[PDB]
Amino acid sequence: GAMAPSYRVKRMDIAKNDEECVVNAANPRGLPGDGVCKAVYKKWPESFKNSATPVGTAKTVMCGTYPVIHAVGPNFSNYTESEGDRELAAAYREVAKEVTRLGVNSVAIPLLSTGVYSGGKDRLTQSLNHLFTAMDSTDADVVIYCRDKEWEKKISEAIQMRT
Numbered sequence: 001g002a003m004a005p006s007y008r009v010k011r012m013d014i015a016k017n018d019e020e021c022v023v024n025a026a027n028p029r030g031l032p033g034d035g036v037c038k039a040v041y042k043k044w045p046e047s048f049k050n051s052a053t054p055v056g057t058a059k060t061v062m063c064g065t066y067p068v069i070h071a072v073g074p075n076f077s078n079y080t081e082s083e084g085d086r087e088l089a090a091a092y093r094e095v096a097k098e099v100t101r102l103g104v105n106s107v108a109i110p111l112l113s114t115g116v117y118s119g120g121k122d123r124l125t126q127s128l129n130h131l132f133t134a135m136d137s138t139d140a141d142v143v144i145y146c147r148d149k150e151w152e153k154k155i156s157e158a159i160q161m162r163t
């Protein structure tokens with residue numbers, strides 16, 4: 001594990017992360033997809049072999065020796081608020097289990113179920129809180145990657161508020 005496990009946020013492409021493994025905001029079918037998923041596909045295409053997995057789960061596939069953890073968050077256009085919230089929390093718990101199993105000292109992670117899976121709602125606080133609930137008991141350094149400029153400031157404030 002990391003010597004002093006921490007949380008950090010960076011506004012940049014997760015495909016260019018400086019961590020020991022990456023979490024993909026995957027679709028359930030293991031398709032190249034769009035946004036984060038497409039960037040992950042362009043960088044580690046070999047990791048998409050048999051990467052299909054149900055909503056609320058995570059499946060790791062190695063690209064060489066670099067682990068890609070395909071985490072499938074719910075699309076809130078399809079799920080109710082209650083059922084979607086439960087699947088989103090579950091997807092993050094499965095990511096924590098995989099990060100622990102892999103023995104990595106750091107992990108790059110995006111905010112699951114935001115953007116096109118958000119059902120047109122701002123889900124920064126909801127997704128980030130579920131990320132903390134799952135990762136708080138792990139000892140990996142967590143680096144959150146985002147694209148929205150207002151989101152970088154909000155995530156940074158949320159991390160600092162807890163320290």
Ligand SMILES: C[C@H](C(=O)O)[C@@H](NC(=O)c1ncnc2[nH]ccc12)c1ccc(Br)cc1
Pocket residue numbers: 012013014015025035036039073110111112113114115116117145146147148151
């Ligand atoms: C809404 C969120 C953000 O702005 O942080 C967005 N992130 C991104 O697209 C994004 N964030 C980090 N590295 C990236 N590389 C290429 C894209 C990209 C995102 C949308 C939908 C889902 Br599901 C998950 C994440």
